[PDB]
Amino acid sequence: AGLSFDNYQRNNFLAENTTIVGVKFNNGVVIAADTRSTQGPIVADKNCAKLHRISPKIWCAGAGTAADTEAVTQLIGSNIELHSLYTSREPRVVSALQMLKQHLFKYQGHIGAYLIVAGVDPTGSHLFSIHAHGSTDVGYYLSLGSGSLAAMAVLESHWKQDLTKEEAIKLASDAIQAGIWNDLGSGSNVDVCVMEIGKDAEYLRNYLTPSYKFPRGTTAVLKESIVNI
């Protein structure tokens, strides 16, 4: 059951032959990320959504192996949804942190999911970062991805206590812009989500957004046929 290792030996035989930032402000927390996805040096898919939704007021953004981040995040989202239904309560961010880190620790870091989890619960706002090995830390502001260092510089330079909603959005967006210009892995547009204690989460997709028609018949055709559904 579960992940099978069904072709580990066969694959071995054959072989032998982004920027994410979280900013906590006075009445909530802000999570922002870029929208460039790269398959190696190539830009596989621009305009990509990197802000996952564990719950309505708990949002996640990750780096590393993409599939691993998507796989666990969706899995934890189901547990949060089920647990909330079971307990008939608004889920806590700490809840997601415990199962998320316990799950990653179970796989010895082979599941390469590095995540930033931000959300608001009845006990207040929270902002956590999670590594593939399960280690976590809590901070007022965080950054992740290849452009983390560039983004952190902006955060450290400008961040201050009890930021306002407008300032945090500008700070997070500005931090992502720094990674976009200075890091190759980051680029395209910026996705911003704002979670507040007493309000619904606002997902600001595309918050910032910084002929060869050949004549018909050019390509020769050997034969044509009609396929039936």
Partner: protein, 175 residues
Amino acid sequence: SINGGIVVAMTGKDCVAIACDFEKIFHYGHVFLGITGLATDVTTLNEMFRYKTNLYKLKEERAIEPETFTQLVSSSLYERRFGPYFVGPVVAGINSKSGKPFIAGFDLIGCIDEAKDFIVSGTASDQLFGMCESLYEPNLEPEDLFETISQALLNAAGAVVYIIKKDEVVKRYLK
């Protein structure tokens, strides 16, 4: 060897085009799947998806839509996350209800790259990313779409092209 073929998918105006260089393009209802990589994995995945989609049709009395099939392939691929299938698949189809053309591309373990313009996979893709972008435009007609998709495939590299309409599919071969 028959391994390493190249497959490309493009989105047009109320139509999609999927082409490839034994056949690597398979359809389960009105959704088309193209797989590039090891031939053994290509054969295995088709049988698995035929097994899964056929049960889906029987249980639900409804054909699987491309959007739903996209998640099914991703979940199936993530299984065997350790020792995955050495394949890069591409799905192309039109949703029966909304009629919105849909295409997507995956990595070994199912990372959904739901590009709105074009999708490529397999060997020699690095050359085909740029050529598709230089030639691609939004909202091509089915006939104009064929020229753009065929020209990118042939010059980048027989070849076969599928033009998928709402209730009509055209299969073509190229020199």
